[PDB]
Amino acid sequence: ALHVPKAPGFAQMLKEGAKHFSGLEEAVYRNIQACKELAQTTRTAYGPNGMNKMVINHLEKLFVTNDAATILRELEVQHPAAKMIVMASHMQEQEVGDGTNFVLVFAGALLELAEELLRIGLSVSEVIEGYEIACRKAHEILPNLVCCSAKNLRDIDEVSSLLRTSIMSKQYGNEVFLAKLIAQACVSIFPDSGHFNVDNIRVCKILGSGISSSSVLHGMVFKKETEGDVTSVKDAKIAVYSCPFDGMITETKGTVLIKTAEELMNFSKGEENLMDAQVKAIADTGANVVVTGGKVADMALHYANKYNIMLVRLNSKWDLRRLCKTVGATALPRLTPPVLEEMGHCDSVYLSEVGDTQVVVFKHEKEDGAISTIVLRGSTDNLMDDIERAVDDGVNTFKVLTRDKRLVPGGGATEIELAKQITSYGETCPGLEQYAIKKFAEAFEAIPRALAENSGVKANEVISKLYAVHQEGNKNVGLDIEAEVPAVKDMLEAGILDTYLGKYWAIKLATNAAVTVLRVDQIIMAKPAGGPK
Amino acid sequence: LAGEGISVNTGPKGVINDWRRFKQLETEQREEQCREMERLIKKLSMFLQQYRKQRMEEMRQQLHKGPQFKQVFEISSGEGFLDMIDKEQKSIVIMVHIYEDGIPGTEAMNGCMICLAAEYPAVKFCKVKSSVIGASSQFTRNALPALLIYKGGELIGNFVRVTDQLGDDFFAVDLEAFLQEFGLLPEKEVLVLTSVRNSATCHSEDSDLEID
Amino acid sequence: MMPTPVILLKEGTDSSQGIPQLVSNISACQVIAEAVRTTLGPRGMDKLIVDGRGKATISNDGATILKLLDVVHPAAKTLVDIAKSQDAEVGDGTTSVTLLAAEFLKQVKPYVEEGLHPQIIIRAFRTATQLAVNKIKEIAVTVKKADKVEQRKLLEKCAMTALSSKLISQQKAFFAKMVVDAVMMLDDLLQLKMIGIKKVQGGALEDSQLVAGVAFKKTFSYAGFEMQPKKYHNPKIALLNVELELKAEKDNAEIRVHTVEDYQAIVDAEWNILYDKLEKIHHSGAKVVLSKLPIGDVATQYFADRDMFCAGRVPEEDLKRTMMACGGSIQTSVNALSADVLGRCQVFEETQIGGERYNFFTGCPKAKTCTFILRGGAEQFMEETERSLHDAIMIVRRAIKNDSVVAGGGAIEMELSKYLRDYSRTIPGKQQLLIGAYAKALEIIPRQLCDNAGFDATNILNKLRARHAQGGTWYGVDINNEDIADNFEAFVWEPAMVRINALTAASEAACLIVSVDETIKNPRS
Amino acid sequence: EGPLSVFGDRSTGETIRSQNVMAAASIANIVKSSLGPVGLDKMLVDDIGDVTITNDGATILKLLEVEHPAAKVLCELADLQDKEVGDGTTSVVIIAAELLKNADELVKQKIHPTSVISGYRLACKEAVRYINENLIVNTDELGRDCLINAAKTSMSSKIIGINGDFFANMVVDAVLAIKYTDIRGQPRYPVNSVNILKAHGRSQMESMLISGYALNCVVGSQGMPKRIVNAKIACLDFSLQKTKMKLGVQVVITDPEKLDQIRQRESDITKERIQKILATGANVILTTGGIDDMCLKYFVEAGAMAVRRVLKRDLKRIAKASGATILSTLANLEGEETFEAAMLGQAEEVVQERICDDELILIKNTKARTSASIILRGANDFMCDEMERSLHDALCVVKRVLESKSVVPGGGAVEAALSIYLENYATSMGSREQLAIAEFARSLLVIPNTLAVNAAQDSTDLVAKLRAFHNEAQVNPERKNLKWIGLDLSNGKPRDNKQAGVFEPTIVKVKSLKFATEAAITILRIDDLIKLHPES
């Protein structure tokens, strides 16, 4: 009577390192606790008053940021339920670009309230049905909460005002300047055709002069140098070649079979003459810049230097394609001289040094082009990385605005209005699902609560004020960040607006993740074993 | 303390037998110490894509056919390992398995070697515990499952943590393909089922000779 | 903390959160700044750091010392990063950026301890830094004359101020003149690669020389090299990229013959190819032959027989400098060696320099390059001399870019602190405390100068504050006279952008450090 | 290893000075979260599962294991404050570490430590002088309410704080009971003569104040009565056992007939003594020594309570309270053995009271003197122990107020006033001392800062408003009522603490400054450390 044996049946047949969890307390409550812990970890980095987190991954690489998706991806989350919530957040990041923290906070709140509902007596099926009903109601209500629309995307001022809110949460101190930069970069891109490509905006990070010295260049910047002696062209005539700048060779195997003395003596002379003829034929088309994706032969380099031809070597094919897009050239596969339609043009190409790094600049005089680049300065690599993440968020916001032009008030106004309307609807609904609907409505309060907590005020007073103000009917009212006392203000005048599509997708994904986590009843984990990656 | 230029005369000469007595023992010990050192420490410090033929190779790998199915050679002495690797013809490959009883990832390996021995009679599959060899504490604790391979008296196989690239459910087909990827398994030969045996001995033939 | 059977993160994950984490970050920044504290000003010292292999390095340079430290603290690495950033953008003041950032953090540490919201501190830092940068731009002294003599004197004074903290400070005037003369020859881009720097053991510092041309070490002469004359009074230089050897015509060349006459013809053809290249080079009229690729012994003897000079395996940067000094081109083919592609220098000579042989190209009138030949008693001696010269060269290049100067010795910072205190006296009071703390932290550099020099810092700072309050912008620390003086009249000049970038980088680092509330350390793979 | 050739480590200059500040700051940071009404307790697991939940600074630092000599100085500083004052233990550690931390900054600024020490000594003397002249309130003009208010401040930040309305009256009535005057006619209050008994069970509000004395003892035999209507207490300091002859006496029998009578005397000696004690009418017999079984029977037959193994200190308190006399022996000055009725203490009742499955003696309404005891009821042993520690502080606070009849406003009112005054006064002493005295003035503000930060409020604004109010008091002669303005942690705004009844004994603040200054001076005096390697 000193040991409790394993129960006969499945308990004995289990493997050595395996783990089995079944029932409410062992599985569902524990999953809810894990998801709540994940939400707690990410909570403090929400809103303009969010705090950056120094995260160091297994490779001893330092990340400091407040982007929820980056923080989650830099943490090796082990619990499968939190893994699922992270997958939902990453899916939201991929689909929209902003709102990962909203997804995570909403999922955590929903799961916590689901745990409370299960404790007070409801069933999992009832809770899931209630959340699905409430999510459908919220998606119905959301279009009616739209306050204004973009109504113009070729303008600089309007696009800057629209993009300020997205990049105010990250880099709160200085958002106007970054908004102006990203607005200019996006307006240069996005031609009369309605299609907008996010990848057409490039970011170059050059260290040294503080982020306020960043600028926008209509073209591209490569952290390389020029192989040849020429380092400046004023009427660029780029002739892109995807082949190495050398005489082509046989693909199977080539051996120089010499049978007489004269052939041996004349081989090198003939080869050099052929190289010179090819390079002169290239130069006779007026081309003065040559960009090659392969190696550069010594004799080819010499003959190019003889004819005053700039040489730029691009190691990556993606850079070659981007340069072709931004210049207007075609990546030739042979050393044949380029024809006029394949002839690349640019306003200016030169070699310049920024800070202490030599760069090659392909600059367009016009405020237009296929590809635009943002030269980012700063005093730290991590700071420039954060500025790049903010730039990505702003560009994704611009893309979403291109897809859908509707906007809803931010700063917890939309969440409070949604909670109020869903609570009002839940009263009219009889049956047991009304509790789940009301908890779904209450879960929206975690957004204004997080904003108030991060801003340093009492969340309860802010929430009560928001409910009162929305009770009279001002549905565009959220908390005021620039105040040391709990206060609210109208977001429409303040211009604090977030994309409707982002809210829609974030709510959908958070609800789906919470419901899918709730559906799980048993967990059969296997021995972790190895898995180096 | 002076006269350090001793230039000793016969002391070491007079004790030459006693000196060789333990010098030979130390040489014998460092024989296996150097043989093992070549394994320890250095690696201890750290729809054709779906194998259509894997299944069918599994079924006709169940072709024991002959008498019983035998078992891998078990080595219970380090000197036994040393004087079996030192001896024997170096033309054919010698494969050694290191294991400790109880630890997972062993029985599957032994079954794979058992199945492969029938496929390749030339190979000399054998297994030995890490305890008798004299493996280090780290190698014993978390480096036991390893396929030591020797050919020509020198290492040809440098495999430890075979479960990392094989898991724990790997079959003989998986191990055979993995080894053939590196070109270490000797190529198969055509074989037929003899009645049982023909030959008895080889000596002066004295065959038939019709003479007047 | 109840133990979950299935924990959220991986085992061994370390997480420190809250006010203690930020206080630890500030303390770590202080610790890092202490390691470079005493290397400031004319009375600064040098630090010796030994790597694992035992190769010691001696430096007065803040960025070098910080890099040589194996800093792993995530908050402390920001100071090293901003030091490297200041070195890249400006090249001088790498100690000042770290000192200022750590002083900012130390000044705001008490307010953090009492629960002040970090966003307020960050906003105050941004406002103070913007105001200080605008003040520096406004009160920086510039001359609207572009006079050659005045500009040269300004550059020389800036270089002397930059150099007057290193072991070559005794010869600071000499080295500043050399640096200014070197920089003025660079044409438009002022590329560093166009200023050679060679180091040879033996000799006093005053034996260092600047060659108006190019010089490089002798490169593995073959047999028959000693029969080549070693002085030419108007040589024509044939800069080549050619291997002058008897070798296979091509890597994949195969010769198939079936007659002894053809065999002899092939041998004579190889010899004739080599002799054709050599004869073309000789008939080009050149007297000095330099090749990036090796030059064989046969070619060396051929050139000796013609009273010419050869040198193979010349490093590429040396050939580029020779091109810039003499004015030719690097011909990969000898088939067209026209007169225009041949470099020309007045005198070429090979001399003995401290136990080594160096080839000298002097007398170039159109040279756009130079080469520093540094003499010293030890390897680290020349290394530190090169670092100091690099600092001076960067300062002079940037001063060529723009001639805006502010007086050094902390005078500019005392003026900035006075201005910031004056501003902070006229704001509500939550920002006032933080801006006053910023102004107080701006006084670290004069105090550090006094501490390193061995004065009484408090009295000097009191005198400086009184002088700045009562009038007088450029009054800073006078190290020799144990007192204060007008550093503008004392020619303690530095470019204003140096202080601009120092303040900007220090403010950005302080804001980034303060903005962090949690640190998560995943277990190493 | 160097030319000095000493077997041990060595630290010199700013290296050791920073270590001492780091060590002192570490101790303060331990207890900074246990200060003020919004402070919280701590669990101290004792490596074997023993749990100690406490808020007292002395108790925390006594249990902690410390290694650094500088930290040991502050840990012993807390114990000294507890012994000599009884309250303010957490404040003195916080102030001393803050005094040392600010003094180190001046030393790093090349200010000589002697000047800093000279400045600190001057500031401490003037802070004490200023307190005794402008910040003290005489308890004569307040009455009985000040003692309750002074006590209620003590229970604040303790587990009995919210019920302090009921506990303050219970504490005050206990101290007034044990009061008696001595030579020169100076009343004194022997606090810790109020026996405190812990027993879990009912809520804290059912804690009892016994108008007498309580013993953690029971009657010797179950056959005795468990209640005496009119006790005649007899206190003995010897054992009522079988009489065994001393070591120097030997019993040798040569006539076998004499053996039986000698064995009779081994028990009849004790019986005669007990008969003498009972013949005088004694009902309750309290003894420090043991009692054998047969002797217990004599009290049983007489119907008298007999308690054995009574603590020596408990017996003294009962004898003083009941008027009895401790008798180490039954020997008069005539060489005989007798027990007179004059050596009998009297009480109106003695009860074997039962308290939560355990029983204890209640000696109710002692005559010729007044005595008090307190029984604390809690949810478990863990909370009962903390109630005793909290109650001990309250008894000490009331003792200081009754003896020294001056009080000062609480809630950082004194610290804020001193910071304004000292920094203004610091502008008249040389040049080096001015910085040291100003730092002393600023270092005092850690107390109001620590109270505010515990309540999660804007400590920067509250102290600024608190300092602003005090600044007006020191510059405007007709606005001197602002001296009493302190902190109100419930609402986060300045409040007139004299009206609010937040008081402290003047000795708590004054002794804190003297102890903190000298402790800070001792550490500041060091600039080198030699740590010899242990011989093991």
Ligand SMILES: Nc1ncnc2c1ncn2[C@@H]1O[C@H](COP(=O)(O)OP(=O)(O)O)[C@@H](O)[C@H]1O
């Ligand atoms: N100036 C502002 N005032 C109030 N709320 C703001 C302001 N700027 C942004 N927000 C709010 O912050 C939220 C964005 O938080 P963020 O850190 O971007 O998380 P996510 O990346 O998941 O959107 C939005 O819901 C928006 O309402």
Ligand SMILES: Nc1ncnc2c1ncn2[C@@H]1O[C@H](COP(=O)(O)OP(=O)(O)O)[C@@H](O)[C@H]1O
């Ligand atoms: N002769 C001088 N007199 C007074 N101050 C000087 C003098 N030379 C340099 N300084 C001061 O020393 C400070 C630090 O410069 P230095 O130590 O040379 O480079 P770094 O800042 O890179 O360490 C500068 O701010 C400058 O004002």
Ligand SMILES: Nc1ncnc2c1ncn2[C@@H]1O[C@H](COP(=O)(O)OP(=O)(O)O)[C@@H](O)[C@H]1O
């Ligand atoms: N009701 C109250 N309102 C404001 N301040 C108070 C109140 N009660 C106590 N305080 C203050 O809180 C400080 C902390 O006291 P406490 O830490 O409980 O004593 P100790 O230092 O002996 O542990 C005291 O200096 C006191 O002035």
Ligand SMILES: [Mg+2]
């Ligand atoms: Mg966002």
Ligand SMILES: [Mg+2]
């Ligand atoms: Mg310098």
Ligand SMILES: [Mg+2]
């Ligand atoms: Mg107290």
